Design a protein around this ligand. Structure first.
Ligand SMILES: Nc1ncnc2c1ncn2[C@@H]1O[C@H](CSCC[C@H](N)C(=O)O)[C@@H](O)[C@H]1O
Ligand SMILES: Nc1ncnc2c1ncn2[C@@H]1O[C@H](CSCC[C@H](N)C(=O)O)[C@@H](O)[C@H]1O
Ligand code: NA
Ligand code: NA
Lengths: 371, 283, 371, 283
RNA sequence: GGCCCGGAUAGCUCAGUCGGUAGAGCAUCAGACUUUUAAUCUGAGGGUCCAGGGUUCAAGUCCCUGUUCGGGCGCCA
RNA sequence: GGCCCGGAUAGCUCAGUCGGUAGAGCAUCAGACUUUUAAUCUGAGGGUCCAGGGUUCAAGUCCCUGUUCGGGCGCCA
């Protein structure tokens, strides 16, 4: 609803995002600056901000002759009539920023001779550097998936956000499902699944190493209620399961977690043994082929599965292997290309075409085996 | 069925999806005494379908066989009767995530069209959410109501037959998200704002032509919408084939071995439409 | 300049192309029709035409209430007030076509209630079927490359026209060069190279089987002067060359060709032996890797080479192998995506994005070997 | 050199391209007594370059080395001094073929800019063709003339310093092809028609923004141009790497083998501009 | 009796239950070859999707009818 | 004396002559483990590119200066 202390949150400046948890009297950095989040409270999500003295102040939500050609515009280097030393003074003096802009404009001999568009562009370039405006928004799969692909793409195996969206849809992720996921994407996929399940149903997370990564998952700010249906089970004990051959003051706290974890793992293994899961989602740094061939056995017939891979070649093998094994139908190897656009009056065009580094997907439905 | 919950067994009234080989498929309404003809033979519902579990191999007639799949919006989208051009699952996936749709979401939509997006939304916002959709074509509106009842999702959707650009969505300040798929969405931006909660929400419009996008963006800005983004998403699908390029004859008597390749099904990927997103916040 | 008998030519209707040679009293088909080309002469290239009685007639170069919505438009199926039998009459009667359109419009109850755009679209659909207009244009690499990719893409290994263009540029094809080409693209690549060389320099074509394919090459309508610099040499005798170990009335005509071909082949082998070629172009159905590793030996240092392949995987191996062999620099594995646009008032958007089936290119420059 | 003919040996006045490893490169004007510094050491022209053949490995200083490449428009495009944004070889390749450029072609161009396209055209239309290019910025115009003389291609090109939209290209009814790279090309469509031969020819305009394209297409149609086509070409470049995805630990004690992949150098391919083509015919 | 389902592009004729329809064969032509009213092998040329109407947004993976080829059900819709 | 060339993103510090800069290391933290003012192994968190100006089309693979790290040339520009 409205912002509050302890709330997990995402900061946005232009298209740049960074997630943080709000704490009274705590220092965090964002794009070359230092904040104290105390001042951002009681304000609605979508609120804007500016830095001042280490503290953020609530700013408003909102806030002509020109040439035709550049035929006589020359790059003398002597167009701005104030120095690289003068310039620091204005900041060292801690003036607003909007005035630093107005000053730079006024001291530009060429500005008036520039085209209206060239002018608009000159200003936008200056504002972006001197008028640092920070927005505070609510965490969501949209925002967190876009943040991660831009800020830490290696942590999520370069899974682009449009690709993540396809996985959620192709896997028919929804409330009530019993879902199996195997992710090394910092818990982003897990969290996205959890958002779309809304606390209804169950998720069984297979993890490598000593535990599941859920750094991203935490950024979502989920209720405790969503944890009751969340299970985890070590990936190294999967083979045993498909064969049935599966089994001073903190030392106690360590005994508590180890047994309460043992417990939660036994429950999880029971649920898996039922082999009646409503879907399978795989997105990891590991080779997918063996993961699928094993994990599908936990999935019920007429259920969707989706496998992500940063590379295509591994999914080609997995396609062929699933075709030998059988038990699947409507196999589809896919990729999505994403293009974003600048839409301005008389200045409309595409910016970037994201392709090849957004990843690949292999999807299909389970079916009953021949016997 | 249902569309909103997986069930083990096929029952009367269920919409079932038959896979006929390759990627071809057909949707069927299961009724006692009914028959369905396919290239692999005949299916007698009362004995070949009803009572049987989804995902099974169904022998048809002369030893022919078929697989029967549980309905989903994605499968429905590929088998539903067109009364309009529809959105496919690639655009729908992006729309759903970027609108921040989830269980409990209240959503406004126009136009209903053939219900492809409608079913996806319902699947996503159930069991606690609701969809207020709008269609100014009486017959398409009613055909949509019929399907929603047949598929047992009427609880989560209300269809209103009216012009969204004059009379709005039929609700005010209740929606977390608004989705537009109409020819003149810039004339509905005000109503979208009115439909969205005062606390704020998300907006998305689908337009084939860039001039429609330009007008939409202009209207969004003027009304107070923020975080404007215009995107296009393009699906590419690959066939998995083994190919072998024959070695050249240079006259000589290893580096020419067969290989797996992922080749596009089509040499060209088409354009559906641009997707323009925005956010509503107080201030 | 202007059209004449014997001229090689290309016919165009909408975006559809077909190449043919003009001959007096000769029957050819084009998109469901029969022509006599006799009538198309003395006319300038770019001229338009219509069929009539098996003959083409020169036509001119050139030649309002509506609704807002379709909310009340219904698909009764009873909107056109003339029959599928009535319709044949108009054609069986051999009427113009424009009137058949005007008639169809007049007999459409819904037309007036349609949007202006929907109307424009309705007409365009009808004109395209009833107003068959044929343009006659001059052969060029542009037109022939576009024709082949649309009409016979398998004959040219699915080399899209933008990809062909890149090859010509990356290989710095120009007048004066001594070029080596190995093509199984019906002679299209050969012809494109010949257009850009303008009769200056030399081309040595390595061919498989009993001879080089030049069907496409012939469509260009090149002067005899371009043949003097054109050489051919069998690909099966290449290994011998790099080792120096290379050697009732028509029966005579067969002896003439066989010796005059033997001759031309000896010249060609001499030119190759100089190992001073200015570039190498490869586009075939054969695996490229061995072709390159052999053929580069004929190329001089500081010269560009370009290899086409419909598939990527083979070029990955070739990249690695060239890297072992050495003698190359600035290796570049590339692909081009092509998008075309509909540009109309209030109706502007992309149509198709051509990707993956246009092919791949491996390019670089030769350099001197270490010794 | 020359730009229009391959020569075996490096000589004074030649523009040489040094490859510095990776894909990095630098262009150099070869002069006696001159020195060039690179990350691999120093090159003394009079002894390390002059007299030596292109394609050779040149030892520099402390045992460092470089390769020296013969100039081409493509290499020049990647090493020339920007006085403007320029077109790269992918757009130039398409422009060249679609304009039907060949030896003997007469071509009109505006604006000259930094001469990237100019050099490509000259390479293509030599030895019998000619380029009439136009640039209304005095300094850019003169810098272009200087380069053309330095590269010994002045014979094939004439630079005229004037506004192409008011005064045209400086010639009339002589051109087989016209190429525009300016902000307001719709104001030059008439002059393009006047510049092209009466017998006809080809037209191409490069514009970053779709609104510029729309105006251009409108003007082309009104003036009598035909065969209007608007295209965009997008280059994708791949790095060839061997990758190995580690097998998962399922607890078990072949299908996980390393592989060659072609991965994009960049996760996104940018937009340069739209290319609009058309044809001029009498009638 | 009818109903249901699937096809139609090259001169002719075909094309897979893996999400297998720009892939082929026949025939024709050329080269080579020997066996010559000619055979054989290799290769090449040949492609824009049956016709008509309706309709979707200003993007058809839409619909109806006609012709024709095929599969299935049974006197029921 | 100067000139030329190349670098600067994570708290810190690095990154290849194949067209090798979202790739890492250090440190920190967690898990496991034993040797516990703690070690070891495994894993995790941490990224938007030094600062300022100019300029290209309404797309920078553009330029100048400052700070600082490094390579090279020689008293020449
Ligand atoms: N002003 C308006 N008010 C309500 N509906 C409208 C409208 N303008 C157009 N429409 C309806 O919007 C629909 C667009 S087709 C939309 C299809 C839909 N997205 C799907 O996936 O199924 C049409 O059916 C049309 O009747
Ligand atoms: N009306 C006009 N007449 C002549 N030149 C113009 C012009 N309008 C813009 N220009 C020039 O056109 C150039 C566009 S930059 C073009 C770069 C060029 N295509 C290249 O590859 O190098 C600018 O230098 C500008 O000065
Ligand atoms: Na046929
Ligand atoms: Na640093």
């Amino acid at each position: 609803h409205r912002i509050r202390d302890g709330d997990f949150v995402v900061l946005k400046r232009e298209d740049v995002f960074k997630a943080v948890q709000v704490q009274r009297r705590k220092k965090v950095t964002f794009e070359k600056q230092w904040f104290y989040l105390d001042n951002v409270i009681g304000h609605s999500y979508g609120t804007a901000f500016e830095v001042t003295s280490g503290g953020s102040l609530q700013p408003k939500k909102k806030r002509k002759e020109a040439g035709t050609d550049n035929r006589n515009i020359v790059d003398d280097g002597k167009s701005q009539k104030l120095t690289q030393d003068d310039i620091k003074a204005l900041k060292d003096k801690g003036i607003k920023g909007e005035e630093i802009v107005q000053q730079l404009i006024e001291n530009s001999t060429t500005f008036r001779d520039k085209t209206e568009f060239a002018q608009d562009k000159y200003i936008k370039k200056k504002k972006k550097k001197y008028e640092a405006i920070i927005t505070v928004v609510k965490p969501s799969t949209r925002i967190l998936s876009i943040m991660y692909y831009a800020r830490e793409p290696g942590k999520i195996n370069h899974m682009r956000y449009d690709t993540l969206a396809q996985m959620l849809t192709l896997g028919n992720i929804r409330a009530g499902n019993k879902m199996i996921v195997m992710e090394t994407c910092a818990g982003l996929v897990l969290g996205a699944m959890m958002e779309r399940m809304g606390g209804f149903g169950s998720i069984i997370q297979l993890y490598p190493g000593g535990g599941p990564v859920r750094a991203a998952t935490a950024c979502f700010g989920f209720p405790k209620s969503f944890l009751s249906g969340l299970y985890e089970f070590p990936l190294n004990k999967v083979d045993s399961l498909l064969h049935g051959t599966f089994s001073k003051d903190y030392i106690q706290e360590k005994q508590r977690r180890q047994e309460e974890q043992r417990k939660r793992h036994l429950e999880a293994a029971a649920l898996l043994s039922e082999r009646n899961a409503d879907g399978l989602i795989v997105a990891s740094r590991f080779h997918p082929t063996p993961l699928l061939l094993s994990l599908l056995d936990f999935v019920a017939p007429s259920r969707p599965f989706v496998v992500y891979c940063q590379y295509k070649e591994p999914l080609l093998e997995c396609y062929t292997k699933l075709r030998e094994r059988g038990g699947v139908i409507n196999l589809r190897l896919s990729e999505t290309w994403l293009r974003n656009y600048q839409v301005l009056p008389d200045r409309s065009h595409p910016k970037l075409l994201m392709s090849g580094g957004g990843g690949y997907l292999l999807s299909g439905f389970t079916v009953a085996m021949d016997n | 069925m249902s569309f909103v919950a997986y069930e083990e067994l096929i029952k009367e009234g269920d919409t079932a999806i038959l896979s006929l080989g390759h990627g071809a498929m057909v949707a069927v309404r299961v009724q006692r005494g009914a028959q369905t003809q396919t290239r692999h033979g005949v299916l007698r519902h009362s004995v070949d379908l009803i009572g049987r579990p989804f995902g099974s191999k169904v022998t048809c007639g002369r030893g022919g066989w078929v697989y029967v799949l549980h309905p989903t919006p994605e499968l429905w989208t590929l088998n539903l009767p067109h009364r309009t051009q529809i959105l496919y699952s690639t655009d729908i996936a992006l729309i759903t995530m970027m609108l921040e749709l989830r269980p409990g979401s209240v959503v406004c939509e126009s136009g209903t069209g053939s219900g492809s997006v409608s079913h996806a939304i319902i699947r996503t916002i159930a069991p606690t959410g609701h969809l207020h959709t709008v269609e100014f074509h009486q017959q398409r509106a009613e055909k949509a109501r019929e399907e929603f009842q047949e598929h047992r999702v009427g609880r989560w959707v209300t269809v209103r037959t009216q012009d969204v650009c004059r009379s709005g969505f039929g609700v005010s300040h209740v929606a977390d998200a608004v989705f537009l798929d109409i020819p003149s969405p810039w004339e509905a931006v005000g109503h979208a704002w009115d439909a969205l909660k005062v606390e704020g929400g998300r907006f998305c419009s689908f337009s084939p032509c860039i001039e429609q996008v330009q007008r939409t963006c202009q209207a969004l800005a003027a009304r107070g919408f923020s975080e404007l983004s215009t995107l296009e998403v393009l699906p590419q699908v690959y066939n998995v084939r083994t190919v072998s390029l024959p070695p050249p004859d240079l006259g000589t008597g290893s580096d020419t071995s067969p290989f797996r390749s992922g080749t596009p099904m089509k040499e060209a990927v088409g354009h559906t439409g641009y997707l323009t997103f925005a956010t509503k916040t107080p201030g």
